[PDB]
Design a protein around this nucleic acid. Structure first.
Length: 431
DNA sequence: GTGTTTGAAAATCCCG
DNA sequence: CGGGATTTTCCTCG
RNA sequence: GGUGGGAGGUCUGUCCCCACCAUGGGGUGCGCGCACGUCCAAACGACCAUAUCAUCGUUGCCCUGCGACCGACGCAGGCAUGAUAUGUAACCAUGCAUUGGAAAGUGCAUGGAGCAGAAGAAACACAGUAGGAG
């Protein structure tokens, strides 16, 4: 009767929220800045055909950036020689297989630039790290002993991060996953019995709003024979008697089930669209960015600053005191702009969070009841041909819905492929 | 939106 | 001053 | 009684707290009152204070007056609207410094955080939010 079922998992990522002291948050911010500086400097040196960053030339002269020269200690030593602020980040966040270069840079150069040599690709198309896409993440390796769940509370744990002392407090410890040969151990029981990986990857991320999250990735090592190197389970709830379900997507409903139940697509954007438009037109007039009277002002004053520096340097010879080059500042957004910016970010975060949780609820309720799903297509680009759904689908981001259905129908191993829904289910059964 | 991934073991550095 | 904490090193990239 | 929100990992209601609207109208039943259920009325990312400004009749009115034309115009004014900045916000307990004879705040270190029902795979990369430079 709707009993929870423990099933084996190949990968997992506990998403908790850190509650660090201001010093701890400052240190992690410095670590993020160090990572972004490393990325930017390395991927500016990649375009110069530097042998220390770029690999061995081919017989034609084609040179690719070999990342082994980026994970070696010599490159990091040279980097920390060039600037000291890069040393404020752990070398594991850079030199490891889940670090800055071997994981992020490799994917960036294999997807964004389509895997092309630095002598045949431009700089404008490559995406750096800046205010538009800041590096709010670092991945390090910590043993399980650095994760000590609090005994009193079922959802509180203390996390110690490298270069930070204080054992940052964490909330959101999912106790619905069990470790061990058959998932009969808690976290402490598995750690004390030596059934956890001696090195575990954790990602510390800072979202758009001021907040911190941690992702403790649990991954089985090898797949030799049939026994995983590290075994962890998770209890999920399934309907006592599952029945085949044909899924049809309508206009006013996010999903229609052949059984009869319905879920009305809340579509939280429009219900909050007035507030979003009000805030947008608000900060469009404030003294922060996205105003066209602050962007232009900052860009201009930067231009005259550069021109004055040039005129002071070469024409004046920079002897002792030539003229007086004014520096001042490069402008900063005001507090009244900042509060509305933070509130706006909080509000899209709330909308996205509401949509994510609603889609999780719908997918969990439908996956357990269904033994064989009958969705039309895996891609939303194949359902906009009629264009009728476009108005609703503009806010109804069904990419997340499709992904959630995909990885919630596979853990129970449910295969994936009202009158219309019944016809679709019948066709799927026939095929 | 669409696609792809997810450590383990030594060599070296440093505070009660 | 020596065990533990941090740094490195592994492998494949046109 | 409603609306919006701040912290308790996420969603709904409740718990604690912050800022606002209502104490209205109507269509019908019963004996001016009670109203079975509603529909409209608001309140939508704070509120107060401080300066510095709307501008093509604006930013509405008072026209506070003045002047000329034949209801309309200009000049010198005032409030209220709106809109940009400075100080100021949102659960509980302890310690320190500082304001306070107190009552109670300020800043720091922290420490703790539900209740009922659902769930909880995260990150990165690329057409974009358009920029950042090395």
């Amino acid at each position: 009767s709707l009993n929870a079922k423990k099933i084996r998992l190949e990968n997992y990522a506990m998403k908790m929220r850190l509650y660090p002291s201001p010093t701890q948050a400052e240190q992690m911010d410095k670590m993020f800045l160090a990572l972004r500086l490393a990325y930017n400097m390395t991927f500016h040196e990649v375009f110069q055909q530097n042998p220390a960053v770029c690999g061995d030339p081919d017989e034609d002269g084609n040179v690719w950036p070999s990342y082994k020269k980026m994970a070696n200690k010599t490159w990091r030593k040279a980097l920390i020689d060039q600037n000291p602020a890069i040393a404020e980040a752990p070398a594991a966040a850079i030199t490891t297989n889940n670090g800055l270069f071997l994981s992020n840079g490799q994917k960036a150069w294999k997807t964004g630039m389509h895997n092309l040599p630095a002598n045949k690709a431009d700089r404008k198309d490559f995406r750096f790290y800046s205010l538009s896409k800041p590096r709010r993440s670092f991945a390090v390796q910590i043993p399980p002993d650095c994760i000590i769940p609090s005994d009193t509370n079922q959802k509180v744990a203390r996390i110690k991060l490298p270069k930070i002392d204080g054992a940052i407090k964490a909330r959101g410890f999912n106790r619905k996953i069990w470790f061990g040969p058959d998932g009969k151990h808690t976290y402490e029981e598995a750690l004390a019995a030596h059934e956890l990986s001696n090195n575990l990857t954790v990602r510390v991320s800072k979202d758009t709003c001021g907040d911190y999250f941690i992702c403790i990735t649990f991954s089985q090592g090898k797949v030799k024979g049939d026994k995983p190197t590290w075994e962890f389970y998770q209890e999920v709830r399934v309907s006592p008697i599952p029945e085949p379900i044909g899924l049809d997507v309508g206009i006013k409903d996010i999903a229609i089930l052949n059984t009869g139940t319905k879920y009305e697509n809340k579509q939280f954007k429009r219900d909050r669209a007035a507030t979003l438009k009000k805030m947008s037109r608000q900060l469009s007039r404030r003294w922060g960015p996205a105003n066209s009277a602050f962007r232009d002002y900052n860009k201009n004053i930067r231009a005259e600053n550069r021109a004055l520096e040039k005129a002071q340097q070469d024409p004046g010879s920079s002897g002792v005191g030539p003229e007086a080059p004014v520096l001042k500042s490069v402008a900063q957004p005001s507090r009244r702009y900042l509060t509305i910016q933070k509130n706006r970010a909080k509000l899209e975060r709330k909308i996205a969070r509401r949509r994510d949780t609603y889609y999780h609820q719908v997918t969990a309720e439908v996956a357990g009841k269904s033994s064989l799903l009958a969705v039309e297509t895996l891609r939303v680009k194949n359902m906009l041909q009629n264009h009728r759904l476009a108005f609703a689908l503009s806010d109804a981001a069904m990419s997340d819905f499709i992904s959630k259905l995909k990885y919630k129908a596979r853990r129970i191993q449910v295969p994936l492929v009202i009158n219309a829904a019944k016809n679709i289910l019948a066709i799927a059964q026939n095929m």
